[PDB]
PDB file of C-alpha atoms in Angstrom:
ATOM      1  CA  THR A  48       4.106  -7.128  18.645  1.00 12.58           C
ATOM      2  CA  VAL A  49       3.228  -4.538  21.201  1.00 15.42           C
ATOM      3  CA  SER A  50       0.879  -3.603  18.370  1.00 14.56           C
ATOM      4  CA  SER A  51      -2.117  -5.678  17.154  1.00 17.86           C
ATOM      5  CA  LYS A  52      -1.920  -3.951  13.706  1.00 17.37           C
ATOM      6  CA  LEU A  53       1.351  -5.745  12.813  1.00 15.30           C
ATOM      7  CA  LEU A  54       2.227  -9.272  11.678  1.00 14.34           C
ATOM      8  CA  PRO A  55       3.559 -11.333  14.688  1.00 15.82           C
ATOM      9  CA  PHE A  56       7.409 -11.002  14.631  1.00 11.66           C
ATOM     10  CA  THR A  57       8.793 -14.530  13.912  1.00  7.20           C
ATOM     11  CA  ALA A  58      12.032 -13.052  12.427  1.00  7.35           C
ATOM     12  CA  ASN A  59      11.394 -14.557   8.962  1.00  8.69           C
ATOM     13  CA  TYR A  60       9.995 -13.087   5.777  1.00 14.11           C
ATOM     14  CA  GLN A  61       6.134 -13.117   5.809  1.00 14.63           C
ATOM     15  CA  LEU A  62       3.498 -12.559   3.191  1.00 17.88           C
ATOM     16  CA  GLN A  63      -0.109 -12.731   4.411  1.00 18.11           C
ATOM     17  CA  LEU A  64      -2.776 -12.119   1.754  1.00 17.88           C
ATOM     18  CA  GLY A  65      -6.351 -11.387   2.963  1.00 16.56           C
ATOM     19  CA  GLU A  66      -8.962 -13.685   1.385  1.00 15.34           C
ATOM     20  CA  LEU A  67     -11.367 -12.271  -1.261  1.00 19.93           C
ATOM     21  CA  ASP A  68     -14.531 -10.891   0.382  1.00 22.05           C
ATOM     22  CA  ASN A  69     -18.104 -11.814  -0.458  1.00 21.18           C
ATOM     23  CA  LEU A  70     -17.847  -9.669  -3.595  1.00 21.84           C
ATOM     24  CA  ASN A  71     -14.597 -11.218  -4.741  1.00 25.74           C
ATOM     25  CA  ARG A  72     -12.611  -8.071  -3.800  1.00 28.20           C
ATOM     26  CA  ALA A  73      -9.036  -8.055  -2.443  1.00 26.77           C
ATOM     27  CA  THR A  74      -9.160  -7.193   1.263  1.00 26.13           C
ATOM     28  CA  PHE A  75      -5.424  -6.579   2.231  1.00 27.48           C
ATOM     29  CA  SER A  76      -1.826  -7.522   1.650  1.00 26.62           C
ATOM     30  CA  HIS A  77       0.591  -7.590   4.544  1.00 26.12           C
ATOM     31  CA  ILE A  78       4.399  -7.993   4.426  1.00 25.42           C
ATOM     32  CA  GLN A  79       7.171  -8.206   6.931  1.00 25.27           C
ATOM     33  CA  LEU A  80      10.647  -8.135   5.361  1.00 23.43           C
ATOM     34  CA  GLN A  81      14.263  -6.955   5.287  1.00 24.23           C
ATOM     35  CA  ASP A  82      16.492  -5.257   2.736  1.00 23.17           C
ATOM     36  CA  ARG A  83      18.013  -8.719   1.856  1.00 25.21           C
ATOM     37  CA  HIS A  84      14.558 -10.089   0.826  1.00 23.35           C
ATOM     38  CA  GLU A  85      13.959  -7.574  -2.081  1.00 22.15           C
ATOM     39  CA  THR A  86      13.148  -8.854  -5.648  1.00 25.24           C
ATOM     40  CA  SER A 113     -17.212   7.009 -23.838  1.00 29.86           C
ATOM     41  CA  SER A 114     -15.230   5.101 -21.253  1.00 33.26           C
ATOM     42  CA  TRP A 115     -12.566   2.509 -20.435  1.00 29.37           C
ATOM     43  CA  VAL A 116     -12.191  -0.166 -17.635  1.00 29.84           C
ATOM     44  CA  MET A 117      -9.649   0.508 -14.990  1.00 32.75           C
ATOM     45  CA  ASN A 118      -6.236  -1.138 -14.678  1.00 33.29           C
ATOM     46  CA  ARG A 119      -5.508  -3.235 -11.671  1.00 32.27           C
ATOM     47  CA  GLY A 120      -2.711  -1.978  -9.421  1.00 33.05           C
ATOM     48  CA  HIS A 121      -0.687  -3.836  -6.784  1.00 32.37           C
ATOM     49  CA  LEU A 122      -1.505  -3.464  -3.098  1.00 34.60           C
ATOM     50  CA  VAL A 123       1.930  -4.437  -1.852  1.00 36.80           C
ATOM     51  CA  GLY A 124       4.360  -3.356  -4.593  1.00 39.26           C
ATOM     52  CA  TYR A 125       6.069  -5.948  -6.813  1.00 37.78           C
ATOM     53  CA  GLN A 126       9.511  -4.651  -5.556  1.00 36.50           C
ATOM     54  CA  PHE A 127       8.586  -5.939  -2.079  1.00 38.13           C
ATOM     55  CA  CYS A 128       6.644  -9.191  -2.564  1.00 35.54           C
ATOM     56  CA  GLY A 129       7.515 -10.512  -6.004  1.00 35.29           C
ATOM     57  CA  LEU A 130       3.867 -11.288  -6.666  1.00 35.60           C
ATOM     58  CA  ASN A 131       2.659 -11.805 -10.163  1.00 34.29           C
ATOM     59  CA  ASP A 132      -0.922 -10.981 -10.851  1.00 35.45           C
ATOM     60  CA  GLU A 133      -2.112 -12.529  -7.640  1.00 33.32           C
ATOM     61  CA  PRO A 134      -5.771 -11.304  -7.449  1.00 29.83           C
ATOM     62  CA  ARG A 135      -5.485 -10.862  -3.666  1.00 31.30           C
ATOM     63  CA  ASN A 136      -2.822  -8.253  -4.286  1.00 33.16           C
ATOM     64  CA  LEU A 137      -4.674  -6.291  -7.035  1.00 33.74           C
ATOM     65  CA  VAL A 138      -7.441  -3.631  -7.095  1.00 33.75           C
ATOM     66  CA  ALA A 139      -8.773  -1.305  -9.785  1.00 35.02           C
ATOM     67  CA  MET A 140      -6.714   1.893  -9.427  1.00 32.44           C
ATOM     68  CA  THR A 141      -6.057   5.199 -11.251  1.00 31.24           C
ATOM     69  CA  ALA A 142      -2.559   5.706 -12.784  1.00 31.98           C
ATOM     70  CA  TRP A 143      -2.470   8.868 -10.674  1.00 30.04           C
ATOM     71  CA  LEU A 144      -2.830   6.906  -7.446  1.00 33.09           C
ATOM     72  CA  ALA A 145      -0.355   4.174  -8.466  1.00 30.13           C
ATOM     73  CA  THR A 146       2.285   6.435  -9.900  1.00 30.81           C
ATOM     74  CA  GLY A 147       1.636  10.011  -8.876  1.00 34.39           C
ATOM     75  CA  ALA A 148       1.288  10.927 -12.560  1.00 34.05           C
ATOM     76  CA  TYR A 149      -0.994  10.752 -15.657  1.00 29.05           C
ATOM     77  CA  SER A 150       1.803   8.701 -17.273  1.00 30.00           C
ATOM     78  CA  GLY A 151       5.281   7.645 -16.291  1.00 29.48           C
ATOM     79  CA  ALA A 152       5.738   8.123 -12.598  1.00 32.89           C
ATOM     80  CA  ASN A 153       6.199  10.993 -10.137  1.00 33.35           C
ATOM     81  CA  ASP A 154       7.441   9.868  -6.727  1.00 33.58           C
ATOM     82  CA  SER A 155       7.334  13.399  -5.343  1.00 35.32           C
ATOM     83  CA  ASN A 156       3.549  13.539  -5.543  1.00 34.89           C
ATOM     84  CA  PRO A 157       2.436  12.582  -2.008  1.00 33.12           C
ATOM     85  CA  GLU A 158      -0.942  11.568  -3.470  1.00 32.62           C
ATOM     86  CA  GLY A 159       0.516   8.567  -5.206  1.00 33.09           C
ATOM     87  CA  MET A 160       1.713   5.259  -3.889  1.00 34.27           C
ATOM     88  CA  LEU A 161       5.126   5.489  -5.559  1.00 30.79           C
ATOM     89  CA  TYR A 162       6.045   8.306  -3.220  1.00 30.60           C
ATOM     90  CA  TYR A 163       5.826   6.004  -0.196  1.00 29.41           C
ATOM     91  CA  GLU A 164       7.003   2.799  -1.885  1.00 28.64           C
ATOM     92  CA  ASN A 165      10.276   4.419  -3.023  1.00 29.33           C
ATOM     93  CA  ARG A 166      10.880   5.912   0.419  1.00 30.84           C
ATOM     94  CA  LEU A 167      10.178   2.596   2.209  1.00 25.72           C
ATOM     95  CA  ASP A 168      12.604   0.851  -0.124  1.00 24.26           C
ATOM     96  CA  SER A 169      15.137   3.662   0.646  1.00 22.66           C
ATOM     97  CA  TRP A 170      14.397   3.112   4.341  1.00 22.05           C
ATOM     98  CA  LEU A 171      15.079  -0.585   4.053  1.00 21.68           C
ATOM     99  CA  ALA A 172      18.453   0.026   2.293  1.00 21.65           C
ATOM    100  CA  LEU A 173      19.499   2.280   5.249  1.00 21.96           C
ATOM    101  CA  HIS A 174      18.317  -0.127   7.965  1.00 18.57           C
ATOM    102  CA  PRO A 175      19.646  -3.487   6.625  1.00 23.58           C
ATOM    103  CA  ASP A 176      19.473  -4.727  10.232  1.00 22.28           C
ATOM    104  CA  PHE A 177      15.787  -3.859  10.689  1.00 22.14           C
ATOM    105  CA  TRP A 178      12.473  -5.256   9.428  1.00 22.01           C
ATOM    106  CA  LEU A 179       9.787  -3.399   7.494  1.00 24.01           C
ATOM    107  CA  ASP A 180       6.191  -4.243   8.510  1.00 21.67           C
ATOM    108  CA  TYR A 181       3.959  -2.981   5.703  1.00 23.74           C
ATOM    109  CA  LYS A 182       0.277  -3.395   5.143  1.00 26.23           C
ATOM    110  CA  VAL A 183      -1.793  -2.174   2.245  1.00 24.50           C
ATOM    111  CA  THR A 184      -5.623  -2.097   2.672  1.00 24.93           C
ATOM    112  CA  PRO A 185      -8.182  -1.021   0.049  1.00 23.74           C
ATOM    113  CA  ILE A 186     -11.186   0.796   1.458  1.00 22.02           C
ATOM    114  CA  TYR A 187     -14.587   0.173  -0.202  1.00 21.48           C
ATOM    115  CA  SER A 188     -18.121   1.385   0.251  1.00 19.39           C
ATOM    116  CA  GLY A 189     -21.129  -0.780  -0.357  1.00 16.47           C
ATOM    117  CA  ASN A 190     -20.758  -3.154  -3.327  1.00 14.23           C
ATOM    118  CA  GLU A 191     -18.339  -1.016  -5.240  1.00 14.12           C
ATOM    119  CA  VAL A 192     -15.673  -2.996  -7.073  1.00 17.71           C
ATOM    120  CA  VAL A 193     -13.343   0.032  -7.031  1.00 18.84           C
ATOM    121  CA  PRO A 194     -12.172   1.065  -3.542  1.00 19.73           C
ATOM    122  CA  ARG A 195     -12.453   4.802  -2.679  1.00 20.38           C
ATOM    123  CA  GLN A 196      -9.119   4.827  -0.911  1.00 21.27           C
ATOM    124  CA  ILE A 197      -5.970   2.807  -0.151  1.00 22.33           C
ATOM    125  CA  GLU A 198      -4.405   2.760   3.324  1.00 22.22           C
ATOM    126  CA  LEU A 199      -0.630   2.280   3.653  1.00 19.21           C
ATOM    127  CA  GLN A 200       0.438   1.133   7.134  1.00 19.40           C
ATOM    128  CA  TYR A 201       4.139   1.029   7.980  1.00 15.39           C
ATOM    129  CA  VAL A 202       6.582   0.870  10.865  1.00 15.89           C
ATOM    130  CA  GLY A 203      10.069  -0.554  11.373  1.00 13.44           C
ATOM    131  CA  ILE A 204      10.985  -3.347  13.797  1.00  9.79           C
ATOM    132  CA  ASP A 205      14.505  -3.849  15.281  1.00 11.08           C
ATOM    133  CA  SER A 206      16.515  -7.029  16.053  1.00 11.68           C
ATOM    134  CA  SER A 207      14.626  -7.518  19.372  1.00 10.12           C
ATOM    135  CA  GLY A 208      11.030  -6.785  18.239  1.00  8.67           C
ATOM    136  CA  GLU A 209      11.075  -3.113  19.267  1.00  9.30           C
ATOM    137  CA  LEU A 210       9.267  -0.622  17.027  1.00 10.51           C
ATOM    138  CA  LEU A 211      10.710   2.208  15.081  1.00 16.59           C
ATOM    139  CA  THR A 212       8.653   5.008  13.610  1.00 21.26           C
ATOM    140  CA  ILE A 213       9.302   5.660   9.918  1.00 23.79           C
ATOM    141  CA  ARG A 214       8.683   9.225   8.836  1.00 24.58           C
ATOM    142  CA  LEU A 215       8.222   9.823   5.088  1.00 23.54           C
ATOM    143  CA  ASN A 216       7.676  13.612   5.450  1.00 25.83           C
ATOM    144  CA  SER A 217       4.028  13.601   4.220  1.00 24.20           C
ATOM    145  CA  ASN A 218       1.052  15.467   5.740  1.00 26.15           C
ATOM    146  CA  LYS A 219      -1.163  12.444   5.144  1.00 26.84           C
ATOM    147  CA  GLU A 220       0.751  10.533   7.797  1.00 24.85           C
ATOM    148  CA  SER A 221      -0.892   9.743  11.066  1.00 26.75           C
ATOM    149  CA  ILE A 222       1.157   8.130  13.881  1.00 27.67           C
ATOM    150  CA  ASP A 223      -0.583   5.933  16.531  1.00 26.84           C
ATOM    151  CA  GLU A 224       0.055   5.393  20.265  1.00 24.55           C
ATOM    152  CA  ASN A 225       2.681   2.799  19.342  1.00 25.58           C
ATOM    153  CA  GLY A 226       4.510   4.734  16.548  1.00 25.92           C
ATOM    154  CA  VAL A 227       2.733   2.929  13.616  1.00 24.97           C
ATOM    155  CA  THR A 228       2.034   5.163  10.642  1.00 25.46           C
ATOM    156  CA  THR A 229      -1.099   5.109   8.500  1.00 26.45           C
ATOM    157  CA  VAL A 230      -1.605   7.121   5.305  1.00 30.17           C
ATOM    158  CA  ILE A 231      -5.020   7.321   3.600  1.00 31.13           C
ATOM    159  CA  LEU A 232      -4.767   7.778  -0.198  1.00 33.84           C
ATOM    160  CA  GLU A 233      -7.642   8.732  -2.452  1.00 36.33           C
ATOM    161  CA  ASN A 234      -8.304   6.281  -5.340  1.00 39.08           C
ATOM    162  CA  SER A 235      -8.962   9.001  -7.931  1.00 39.44           C
ATOM    163  CA  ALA A 236      -7.362  11.384 -10.495  1.00 40.67           C
ATOM    164  CA  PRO A 237      -7.815  15.053 -11.402  1.00 40.58           C
ATOM    165  CA  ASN A 238      -8.898  14.491 -15.006  1.00 41.19           C
ATOM    166  CA  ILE A 239     -11.122  11.442 -14.555  1.00 44.20           C
ATOM    167  CA  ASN A 240     -14.704  10.556 -13.597  1.00 42.80           C
ATOM    168  CA  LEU A 241     -14.802   7.134 -11.935  1.00 43.90           C
ATOM    169  CA  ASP A 242     -17.798   4.970 -11.641  1.00 42.80           C
ATOM    170  CA  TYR A 243     -16.747   3.082  -8.487  1.00 40.33           C
ATOM    171  CA  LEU A 244     -19.665   0.626  -8.874  1.00 40.35           C
ATOM    172  CA  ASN A 245     -18.714  -0.644 -12.345  1.00 40.66           C
ATOM    173  CA  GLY A 246     -15.059   0.081 -12.491  1.00 38.69           C
ATOM    174  CA  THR A 247     -15.158   2.388 -15.538  1.00 38.66           C
ATOM    175  CA  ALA A 248     -13.417   5.654 -16.110  1.00 40.33           C
ATOM    176  CA  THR A 249     -14.271   8.516 -18.511  1.00 42.30           C
ATOM    177  CA  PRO A 250     -12.511  11.923 -18.866  1.00 43.54           C
ATOM    178  CA  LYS A 251     -13.840  15.183 -17.237  1.00 44.06           C
ATOM    179  CA  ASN A 252     -16.290  17.344 -19.365  1.00 44.24           C
TER     180      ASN A 252
END
């Protein structure tokens, strides 16, 4: 609350979805919760903005954007939560954070970043901080170089929506391999 970036602290579970913009693109997904709340070319798969493990959301368009597997999982297939270039890395650690701070809240915002009329965003921003029983803020440090802490202790991480073996057309939302 001493931060404008965060959802106002009512002390209940909150899910605010941004409306679709003029181009029908998801604009953000914002969650405030506790550990007890827990649950030739191809076209790109849609990934979650705020992970299913947090928000329970089932193909809700306002929580989906075209995304490489490498960004969503850290890996070409499966999952690698040690790759700090993937979302899993941070999602798993936030979930771990929640389990160790059962008495605190997680405020977590996920914002796709687009240029022009592209349907595929270039980047995803993860914004996270903890809040205590009395609305005080607690910095959450996930040990990644991408992190950037603001004047209030709120952390933002900019992730590239891409993959090392893939050529994306961000306008049309197609992917072809690198030749």
